[PDB]
Ligand binder design. Structure first.
Ligand SMILES: O=C1OC[C@@H]2CNCCN12
Ligand SMILES: [Hg+2]
Ligand SMILES: [Hg+2]
Ligand SMILES: [Zn+2]
Length: 264
């Protein structure tokens, strides 16, 4: 049971975000994520470029319940699924995506917009090819680019359904399954308008390597889709059930950072 045999970071009362600094001191660092996006402080930057999403040749491989979310993993041994343009210099390869979500529809996102919490947030994680591999990229201030997409509850997202339907097979921590031919273009909204700022990954080890690109337009998913997320488990098989919900970190201090908008 959580925190009895040993301690591990998580999202509970004894090991949640407010505790993470005890094992990962960078949790109190100068470029932590997520942040609140104050729409009356972020300035339009006309030097930013349109975001170039080239996911046509993506190769998904597996889906994994890692005890704090599920990752959909991709073959990143070539430039098969890349993010370019905008604030980015060069080419960033997609390695995985995952979500953060709530126990109820009024919370779940990590970023907020004028303090608004969405029901969930999708993170597509990419690494800068100039550093050769993800592990070297996460030793650099421009090593990663994360495309963040808000989810609200409304109409269903057809391109999400294949994800929803596989979750029964990865209910518990450590379970993985084959998950080929998944097209992440089915998770995008219509507009690629975005905000951008320098930050970190939002789970330990909280690495301060990320250029965040947060889309303004949410995607809609149905109540039934997000309910299926909430049937996942943080625990392993044969351990008592602890539902995988509220796996989000709250907003962190902006400090001296600037949030830029791609749109006037
Ligand atoms: O994010 C927002 O929202 C309002 C303002 C418009 N100009 C771009 C930056 N802003
Ligand atoms: Hg974990
Ligand atoms: Hg890989
Ligand atoms: Zn994330």
């Amino acid at each position: 049971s959580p925190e009895f045999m040993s301690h591990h970071w998580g999202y509970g009362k004894h090991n949640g975000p407010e505790h993470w600094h005890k094992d990962f001191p960078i949790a109190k660092g100068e470029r932590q994520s997520p942040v609140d996006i104050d729409t009356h402080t972020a300035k339009y930057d006309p030097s930013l470029k349109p975001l170039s999403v080239s996911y046509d040749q993506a190769t998904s491989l597996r889906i994994l319940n890692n005890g704090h979310a599920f990752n959909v993993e991709f073959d990143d041994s070539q430039d098969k699924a890349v993010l370019k343009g905008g604030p980015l210099d060069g080419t960033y390869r997609l390695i995985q995506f995952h979500f953060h979500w709530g126990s109820l529809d009024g919370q779940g996102s990590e970023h907020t917009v004028d303090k608004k919490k969405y029901a969930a947030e999708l993170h597509l994680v990419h690494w800068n090819t100039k550093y050769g591999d993800f592990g070297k990229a996460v030793q650099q201030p421009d090593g990663l680019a994360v495309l963040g997409i808000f989810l609200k509850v409304g109409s269903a997202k057809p391109g999400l359904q294949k994800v929803v339907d596989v979750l029964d097979s990865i209910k518990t921590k450590g379970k993985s399954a084959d998950f080929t031919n998944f097209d992440p273009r089915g998770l995008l909204p219509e507009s690629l308008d975005y905000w951008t700022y320098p930050g970190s990954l939002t789970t330990p080890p909280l690495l301060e390597c990320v250029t965040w690109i947060v889309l303004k337009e949410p995607i809609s998913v149905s109540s039934e889709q997000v309910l299926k997320f909430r049937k996942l488990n943080f625990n392993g098989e044969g351990e008592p059930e602890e539902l995988m919900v509220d796996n989000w970190r709250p907003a962190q201090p902006l400090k001296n950072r600037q949030i830029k908008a791609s749109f006037k």
